[PDB]
Write a protein that holds these residues in place. Structure first.
Motif, PDB file in Angstrom:
ATOM      1  N   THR A 223       0.801  -1.173   0.000  1.00 27.50           N
ATOM      2  CA  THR A 223       0.000   0.000   0.000  1.00 27.50           C
ATOM      3  C   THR A 223       0.867   1.270   0.000  1.00 27.50           C
ATOM      4  O   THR A 223       2.078   1.252   0.303  1.00 27.50           O
ATOM      5  CB  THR A 223      -0.943   0.030   1.210  1.00 27.50           C
ATOM      6  OG1 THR A 223      -0.180   0.163   2.405  1.00 27.50           O
ATOM      7  CG2 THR A 223      -1.843  -1.234   1.281  1.00 27.50           C
ATOM      8  N   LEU A 224       0.192   2.381  -0.255  1.00 27.95           N
ATOM      9  CA  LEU A 224       0.775   3.702  -0.140  1.00 27.95           C
ATOM     10  C   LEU A 224       1.303   3.913   1.270  1.00 27.95           C
ATOM     11  O   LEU A 224       2.421   4.341   1.436  1.00 27.95           O
ATOM     12  CB  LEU A 224      -0.269   4.778  -0.522  1.00 27.95           C
ATOM     13  CG  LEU A 224       0.246   6.232  -0.670  1.00 27.95           C
ATOM     14  CD1 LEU A 224       1.328   6.308  -1.756  1.00 27.95           C
ATOM     15  CD2 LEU A 224      -0.971   7.183  -0.955  1.00 27.95           C
ATOM     16  N   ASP A 225       0.498   3.615   2.278  1.00 26.12           N
ATOM     17  CA  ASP A 225       0.946   3.649   3.677  1.00 26.12           C
ATOM     18  C   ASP A 225       2.285   2.846   3.946  1.00 26.12           C
ATOM     19  O   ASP A 225       3.138   3.317   4.672  1.00 26.12           O
ATOM     20  CB  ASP A 225      -0.165   3.091   4.586  1.00 26.12           C
ATOM     21  CG  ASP A 225      -1.345   4.083   4.772  1.00 26.12           C
ATOM     22  OD1 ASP A 225      -2.369   3.662   5.376  1.00 26.12           O
ATOM     23  OD2 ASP A 225      -1.228   5.276   4.356  1.00 26.12           O
ATOM     24  N   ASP A 226       2.407   1.645   3.389  1.00 26.64           N
ATOM     25  CA  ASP A 226       3.652   0.817   3.453  1.00 26.64           C
ATOM     26  C   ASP A 226       4.860   1.540   2.843  1.00 26.64           C
ATOM     27  O   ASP A 226       5.914   1.627   3.458  1.00 26.64           O
ATOM     28  CB  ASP A 226       3.454  -0.480   2.666  1.00 26.64           C
ATOM     29  CG  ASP A 226       2.443  -1.426   3.320  1.00 26.64           C
ATOM     30  OD1 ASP A 226       2.126  -1.196   4.507  1.00 26.64           O
ATOM     31  OD2 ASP A 226       1.979  -2.386   2.615  1.00 26.64           O
TER      32      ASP A 226
ATOM     33  N   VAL B  76      14.240   7.960  -3.514  1.00 29.75           N
ATOM     34  CA  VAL B  76      13.201   7.805  -4.547  1.00 29.75           C
ATOM     35  C   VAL B  76      12.193   6.809  -3.972  1.00 29.75           C
ATOM     36  O   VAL B  76      12.590   5.790  -3.410  1.00 29.75           O
ATOM     37  CB  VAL B  76      13.792   7.288  -5.893  1.00 29.75           C
ATOM     38  CG1 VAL B  76      12.670   7.120  -6.991  1.00 29.75           C
ATOM     39  CG2 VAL B  76      14.858   8.267  -6.429  1.00 29.75           C
ATOM     40  N   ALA B  77      10.900   7.139  -4.019  1.00 33.93           N
ATOM     41  CA  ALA B  77       9.853   6.227  -3.534  1.00 33.93           C
ATOM     42  C   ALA B  77       8.936   5.837  -4.701  1.00 33.93           C
ATOM     43  O   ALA B  77       8.621   6.685  -5.513  1.00 33.93           O
ATOM     44  CB  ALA B  77       9.091   6.880  -2.404  1.00 33.93           C
ATOM     45  N   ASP B  78       8.612   4.539  -4.830  1.00 29.54           N
ATOM     46  CA  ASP B  78       7.640   4.016  -5.835  1.00 29.54           C
ATOM     47  C   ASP B  78       6.221   4.381  -5.477  1.00 29.54           C
ATOM     48  O   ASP B  78       5.834   4.115  -4.353  1.00 29.54           O
ATOM     49  CB  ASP B  78       7.592   2.491  -5.778  1.00 29.54           C
ATOM     50  CG  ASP B  78       8.642   1.805  -6.649  1.00 29.54           C
ATOM     51  OD1 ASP B  78       9.528   2.536  -7.154  1.00 29.54           O
ATOM     52  OD2 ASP B  78       8.597   0.521  -6.788  1.00 29.54           O
ATOM     53  N   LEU B  79       5.430   4.914  -6.409  1.00 29.72           N
ATOM     54  CA  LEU B  79       3.978   4.990  -6.219  1.00 29.72           C
ATOM     55  C   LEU B  79       3.483   3.554  -6.449  1.00 29.72           C
ATOM     56  O   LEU B  79       3.678   2.989  -7.521  1.00 29.72           O
ATOM     57  CB  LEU B  79       3.312   5.955  -7.203  1.00 29.72           C
ATOM     58  CG  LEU B  79       3.580   7.464  -7.040  1.00 29.72           C
ATOM     59  CD1 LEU B  79       2.540   8.268  -7.816  1.00 29.72           C
ATOM     60  CD2 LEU B  79       3.555   7.834  -5.596  1.00 29.72           C
ATOM     61  N   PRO B  80       2.869   2.934  -5.444  1.00 24.26           N
ATOM     62  CA  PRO B  80       2.445   1.558  -5.692  1.00 24.26           C
ATOM     63  C   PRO B  80       1.251   1.435  -6.632  1.00 24.26           C
ATOM     64  O   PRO B  80       0.569   2.424  -7.036  1.00 24.26           O
ATOM     65  CB  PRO B  80       2.101   1.021  -4.297  1.00 24.26           C
ATOM     66  CG  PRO B  80       1.936   2.193  -3.420  1.00 24.26           C
ATOM     67  CD  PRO B  80       2.626   3.366  -4.070  1.00 24.26           C
ATOM     68  N   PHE B  81       1.055   0.197  -7.040  1.00 23.25           N
ATOM     69  CA  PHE B  81      -0.068  -0.201  -7.855  1.00 23.25           C
ATOM     70  C   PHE B  81      -1.349   0.391  -7.391  1.00 23.25           C
ATOM     71  O   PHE B  81      -1.707   0.235  -6.230  1.00 23.25           O
ATOM     72  CB  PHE B  81      -0.286  -1.710  -7.823  1.00 23.25           C
ATOM     73  CG  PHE B  81      -1.369  -2.139  -8.766  1.00 23.25           C
ATOM     74  CD1 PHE B  81      -1.248  -1.856 -10.118  1.00 23.25           C
ATOM     75  CD2 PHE B  81      -2.512  -2.734  -8.302  1.00 23.25           C
ATOM     76  CE1 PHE B  81      -2.254  -2.207 -10.996  1.00 23.25           C
ATOM     77  CE2 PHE B  81      -3.506  -3.094  -9.166  1.00 23.25           C
ATOM     78  CZ  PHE B  81      -3.387  -2.827 -10.514  1.00 23.25           C
ATOM     79  N   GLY B  82      -2.016   1.102  -8.295  1.00 16.76           N
ATOM     80  CA  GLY B  82      -3.342   1.653  -8.031  1.00 16.76           C
ATOM     81  C   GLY B  82      -3.421   3.050  -7.420  1.00 16.76           C
ATOM     82  O   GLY B  82      -4.531   3.562  -7.234  1.00 16.76           O
TER      83      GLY B  82
ATOM     84  N   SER C 174      -0.933  11.071  -4.017  1.00 17.70           N
ATOM     85  CA  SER C 174      -0.048   9.995  -3.570  1.00 17.70           C
ATOM     86  C   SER C 174       1.411  10.472  -3.490  1.00 17.70           C
ATOM     87  O   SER C 174       2.078  10.179  -2.521  1.00 17.70           O
ATOM     88  CB  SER C 174      -0.129   8.782  -4.489  1.00 17.70           C
ATOM     89  OG  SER C 174      -1.452   8.307  -4.597  1.00 17.70           O
ATOM     90  N   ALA C 175       1.880  11.191  -4.509  1.00 15.88           N
ATOM     91  CA  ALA C 175       3.229  11.704  -4.520  1.00 15.88           C
ATOM     92  C   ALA C 175       3.481  12.645  -3.360  1.00 15.88           C
ATOM     93  O   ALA C 175       4.569  12.638  -2.796  1.00 15.88           O
ATOM     94  CB  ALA C 175       3.539  12.411  -5.799  1.00 15.88           C
ATOM     95  N   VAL C 176       2.508  13.498  -3.058  1.00 14.52           N
ATOM     96  CA  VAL C 176       2.693  14.507  -2.022  1.00 14.52           C
ATOM     97  C   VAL C 176       2.870  13.754  -0.689  1.00 14.52           C
ATOM     98  O   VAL C 176       3.725  14.101   0.074  1.00 14.52           O
ATOM     99  CB  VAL C 176       1.498  15.513  -2.013  1.00 14.52           C
ATOM    100  CG1 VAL C 176       1.458  16.303  -0.742  1.00 14.52           C
ATOM    101  CG2 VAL C 176       1.617  16.445  -3.263  1.00 14.52           C
ATOM    102  N   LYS C 177       2.141  12.663  -0.478  1.00 12.60           N
ATOM    103  CA  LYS C 177       2.256  11.907   0.783  1.00 12.60           C
ATOM    104  C   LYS C 177       3.641  11.290   0.900  1.00 12.60           C
ATOM    105  O   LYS C 177       4.265  11.288   1.967  1.00 12.60           O
ATOM    106  CB  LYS C 177       1.182  10.844   0.839  1.00 12.60           C
ATOM    107  CG  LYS C 177       1.272   9.871   2.012  1.00 12.60           C
ATOM    108  CD  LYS C 177      -0.072   9.160   2.183  1.00 12.60           C
ATOM    109  CE  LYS C 177      -0.008   8.024   3.173  1.00 12.60           C
ATOM    110  NZ  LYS C 177      -1.277   8.055   4.035  1.00 12.60           N
ATOM    111  N   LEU C 178       4.161  10.810  -0.213  1.00 13.41           N
ATOM    112  CA  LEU C 178       5.483  10.247  -0.200  1.00 13.41           C
ATOM    113  C   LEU C 178       6.551  11.327   0.038  1.00 13.41           C
ATOM    114  O   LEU C 178       7.512  11.078   0.776  1.00 13.41           O
ATOM    115  CB  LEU C 178       5.708   9.437  -1.472  1.00 13.41           C
ATOM    116  CG  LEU C 178       4.801   8.195  -1.582  1.00 13.41           C
ATOM    117  CD1 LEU C 178       5.288   7.317  -2.695  1.00 13.41           C
ATOM    118  CD2 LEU C 178       4.659   7.386  -0.346  1.00 13.41           C
ATOM    119  N   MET C 179       6.354  12.522  -0.538  1.00 14.29           N
ATOM    120  CA  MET C 179       7.349  13.615  -0.379  1.00 14.29           C
ATOM    121  C   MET C 179       7.359  14.185   1.066  1.00 14.29           C
ATOM    122  O   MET C 179       8.432  14.507   1.613  1.00 14.29           O
ATOM    123  CB  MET C 179       7.147  14.687  -1.441  1.00 14.29           C
ATOM    124  CG  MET C 179       7.655  14.166  -2.783  1.00 14.29           C
ATOM    125  SD  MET C 179       7.537  15.288  -4.134  1.00 14.29           S
ATOM    126  CE  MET C 179       8.846  16.456  -3.709  1.00 14.29           C
TER     127      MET C 179
END
Lengths: 241, 242, 243, 245, 242, 246, 243, 243
Positions: H60-63, H81-87, H98-103
């Motif tokens: 998941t995104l959370d993971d 660098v973080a992968d945007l996961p499937f979906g 999703s990207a903003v959460k990872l950043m």
């Protein structure tokens, strides 16, 4: 029973509409006994009830709360509720916000803004939400007013507008105009309840008259307002620029 | 600035305490200007603001919203808020409710009920929540109610719907100030619902209430007349008693 | 009439039988009140008659709350009583949270089913100003024991369900609070029936303790007024409705 | 009598009048079905007759879903229709989300009130397998009547398979019904519609609104009162002239 | 008079009629079992293994049992519907009650709690509040104490799992309520097996406790009838299954 | 790896003339047994609303319900392809359809099935573009439209299609015109494969056997042998027979 | 086959020392099990070694559950133990709710840190079939008293952290259950280290309790094998690791 | 001392090969940074290597956000660098959320897998200040179209996976941005492997594309140091790791 069509008929008859803000059941019932035509749950409650410096902190739940209170008095007058700032940024949001207020008992909603609001007004009217428009400041003001009427607004508040300019907007529109700080050449008038009752320290706003001073009861103050509006002696020149 | 201690010193000095309900910033400023000692955000708003037959629908958030409005006027008078029905069934619940009202601006809370409230009042007082008790009708039990809540730490008490001689006796027995409504004149002070005393109602004017608006030149003069009448001993009159 | 919890006790003293019926919406509640029903009950019977379930166990607190608010919006002069459903009074603090919700929605009294074990819960509620209607049924000696324990704890009304007429007579005589029977014969301070049964809106057997009051009345109003009058003159429940 | 949407259409072709009633709980729904009510409607009228409100605007999607689940648990043979309440269909996607929720709870068709502007919404639902019942109201030149027909044709053309006509002059309702091919169901629309609807509580005399007859009068039971309605609709004796708009 | 009730199972023990119980997790099988006159259908946490394919039953939640309970109850069987409280949902009596309530709202008529003597207070708490309870236990002297303890607490049914035939016989003799055995021999008031086990829907070697009733039967419905008749005529379980 | 049924292997089966055997499957025990019988594709379908939940229709079945049964089947780690139905209401826009599919593929689905016609084209295209494999699902001027439905979803990207309740000669013509494999239920024997509901073909139904189904339990020693018999009858072309064909 | 709680008690009685390492993911869990690590611990040390935090206080119950489910998916034969993190066992019922969450995720036993105040919590958990690992560390006297208290409440394994060797010997002699040392010398029934420490993935300066078992080994698997062996042959910990 | 997106572009231009490795926690992220790893990738490989799942779909995104925060707290000089996961990138708005959460969790760039269709998404992100790494993998004709379309939309790094050496050579030559190979051969601006694979944590046959860099080395640090050295001297990947 004041309905939206009734307001149109009052304008055509030259009967002036007396509107006042209203935020709870006890005043709503007193206002209705004094034959107030339109009770407004306005974001003015941000200043007069919540004691804030501006109206921006007023939420949609706040307006819905005071709307439910006024509605519970079951007034014969039209119950109108403001959509607060930020609650109509897109037409679908406007509709969700309006629906919430009409569920709480509002019979018409008021949205402030000029020409850009036209699509929103049309969206709402199409979905059976009656709309009151709210414009202020002269060619732009007339353009604004005409666009919201064209989109389907059935009532319009003119705020802080020179009297001759107000008179011309009223003559150009077919819907009733309701003035505050806009002169006597409107189809009706609105004040904030607390202002006209003299419940403010020191500096009375220039647009306002204290109807309470020298009257024997709160009810007689309100009745005086309604009569002065209808016989055209509020607002007077002192209340107008 | 009116504090819980000043209310006690006013009882010692025989100055009567003038309390009024209050639910918004504009009337809160006006009341303060007329030197109302205590402003009460009471569940009477269920009737007077919300237009309901009874007060039971009034929730903690309602009381907290109106308390925040009053506090924002920054009155010098003491701000008291009612815990509404259902919000004080255990001492921990009572505390969570009171804490929410005090965060919103209450300086004291009011809890209605008799002897059984003693453990609740002590719990709250221990934890720095000042408490106004509220009791009513017979006379023997009202008196032990009164004593038990005082003993538990209540620093103010409302006496509601009590014959004048019994209220006179309760006031004598207690050392904290008593605040009457429909309790006659022998109390340390008086309370009325704001909308009642401004006459903002035709028809059924309850017996314990006077209309101080009628024939005054302004709402401010109405409230000032209430405060003077409370202090000089001539409200409430025998008309408003029993 | 304007029926309060103290009026019910007075009615018992004066020998006026209490006419109670279930009620779940604003239209019937106005009709019942126009027919001077003393007490309207938002009962978990709605699980059967409105929700169509085989049992009342799926009825939630939110469901009772919803129907209670409907009935209350009619503003009846009769007393609005609401059932705390199964599972919502397993401790005294839980019972009180559940009751508060029902009272905020318009209930003037709540009904809790249970015997002697409920004593502490009833006392907890009553001390905190929640009026309580008890509810017991079937053995006989324990029944009177249950009834006496919930009365001592503070219940101001009690329902007796599915009880021999002579046993209910005994309980009514021993208790000082009013008793309300359903399938408990005529020697009670009053009667309750599920509305839909007394209007004959079931398929199948009339339950034996029910009379269909609609039959050959000219109107639903007249069926309900017949019920109230029959309760008050003592000819319902009749012997054929008792055991 | 397992009444499906195609069976109503065949009823219209055969000249058998469709009898519709509102229904909000399992007990009445079973009794309506035993009486052979063709269509049961979980309408936002419940706002007035069950919740005791002055208007139907407070009714929520959850209120409709609840009463729909009650009615469906009776397993009637008649068609279960549920209203989308006020505010729940402002966009087609929102309408679809509301409709799905009602069909999950047991509705077989959903009813949407509005005129020509709803045409895209109806298309959207119908294409995604939600059957839709429309609901409209208002000389040869008269503008109201003309707009009503334009509304009716529009929703029909977008795929509505049933339509309610509320408060319409009898002669206008007769022309709408003649122009459309789908069945029309009137209330306060005269007798020349393909069917009729009333609110249960009104027709049982539990309150007449002008459009309503009390069918409990002169009948020995609630069941016989509902049977009388169904028969009266089919024999053409309701609605009467007094019941007209 | 068609429904199998808790009193009816008690009558069956007195009259000597053996109780045939099987696990059931969905409407189709629920109906088939009812047509085969299975007495009790159990929504057990065995679904953790047989349906969910987990290695243990600990992952099975209250929501899973509730879902499968609703599926079984929608078949409207005459047999009694029993549901397990899963691991961790009965740590205090209050929690146990909340969990039971959820299952009974979904269609359980009785709930099953696994544990010995410590469960007595929990059993008592549930039974008092109208929740019928089935106990579940499984040296021989503690087992006997545990069984007496839950019975006294008010359990109206008890499952005996993985217990020597001789020990199980004593338990059944000393208790008054019906015992249902699984891997406990034939001296119980009845038997239970996991549906999928007795239908032979397993890879390779079956547990010692189980007979494959499907093998060589003309239909799934014949297999279930075989099981019911073999429990009732006393020839399941055999010595092999003990 | 080479033991696994993949979508490309199903396309190769169509080419080689090997009939595809599909069954609904809803839990780990049956999913293991089906795989041991060499069932090619196991479908977690909304038929579970009837066969498992006991409902009159499949409309009450939620995405959560399909996701739960998909996880059950997936934990058996079958070799066969795991296909899950998107339930009614979960694909009203393409973004919504993707969110639902994602949920199911996170749960173990390798492919999702969407029921509907021509109108689904944009949605199928949106999902396949985003790496979601799609099984289409069509049925019943009428034959003309079915063929348009079939071609449009294939054009859009579907790699498998179910034909339900279709005249045998019509199904034959659709199968011949498409190049993806077709899977019939009540569509006669001229499809690239067959599907039935598990509980139906095990003869667990209240009384009346539906037209399209054969009870494979009858004449068989075990449930394993029933499922083996199904797979064999599908592959040798003698299920379905004329009496099973619409 | 499977390492079970009784198997560990057997190991103490037979003199086989228990090799315990922390573990937090599927790949390492698989390698540890192939190296016959007896017990894998999802410890709150992950706050330091995985999260890079200065202390372990930020580690939440969801954190422990996540890595527990990662380790559990390797399906090791070794015993899977999970730490209840700080603040998740302040009352017994809280402890049980936390433990239950960790057991649904794959934990077979849970470790709770604290002295004899914990006895009541340990008892509550063991009574509800949650196996418990204790964790403890004049003071010598209190330590022994803490140890015997948690053993008598039902703990079946005890970690001893940062303890003089001779005190740890005494504790171990006095108990029946197996003791697992970290910084407690070699007279324990077994040893635990943090995975990443013993793999030499620390910054330059090594903790005093730790040896870098990876250094000079041809593979990570080899490193872990050397640890297991050294524990079992009694030559870790040495005197440079102990006090 | 920080490695930045424009430094990578400068590495391409100067012929210095970019060494990239996946990384999922603070201990290893510190070690990789001591070894001068240029780019650390929090990839959805963690679904296999940490979570022990058969596929990466369950991540998941959370993971990804959690492992990202872990890596970031080691404060590497290298780029994260973080992968945007499937979906999580089905529409441009959702990709941005999703990207903003990872950043916010510490990612400096996000990697989106997919071809030509992604162009619009990449533009949307890059316009809003999200650095993007593409990920792709005649035949050759589509590979090159996908690559040019994502570069043109604003991607600043691209991963080439399972591509024959010649094709990957042509892609690299035609793009302006640096290319990062995994099983794509030696003519890329740099290389990525999964940490656990190149540490040899997995038993039996390894993926063809992978070398075990732990074989022959005295420490885990020496393994990663060896990988970084072998990429930059051009002697990983070898012909045995390519096709």
């Amino acid at each position: 029973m004041v309905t939206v069509p009734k307001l149109q008929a009052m304008r055509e008859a030259g009967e002036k509409i007396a509107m006042l803000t209203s935020y709870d059941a006890s005043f709503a019932a007193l206002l209705d006994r004094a034959n107030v035509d339109v009770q407004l749950i306005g974001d003015s409650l941000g200043n007069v009830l919540q004691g804030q410096a501006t109206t921006l902190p007023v939420t949609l739940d706040d307006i819905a709360y005071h709307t439910a209170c006024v509605a519970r008095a079951q007034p014969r007058g039209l119950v109108v509720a403001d959509l607060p700032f930020g609650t109509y940024g897109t037409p679908a949001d406007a509709f969700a916000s309006a629906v919430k207020l009409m569920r709480a008992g509002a019979q018409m909603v008021k949205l402030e803004g000029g020409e850009w609001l036209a699509e929103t007004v049309r969206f709402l009217v199409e979905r059976a939400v009656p709309v009151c428009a709210h414009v202020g400041l002269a060619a732009q003001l007339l353009r604004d007013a005409r666009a919201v009427e064209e989109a389907g607004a059935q009532l319009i508040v003119l705020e802080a507008v020179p009297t001759l300019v107000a008179a011309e907007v009223t003559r150009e529109l077919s819907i009733p105009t309701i003035g505050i700080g806009a002169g006597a050449e409107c189809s009706g008038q609105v004040l904030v309840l607390h202002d006209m009752l003299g419940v403010f320290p020191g500096k009375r706003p220039r647009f306002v008259k204290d109807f309470m001073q020298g009257q024997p009861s709160i009810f007689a103050a309100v009745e005086a307002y309604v009569r002065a509006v209808k016989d055209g002696s509020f607002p007077g020149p002192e209340h107008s620029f």
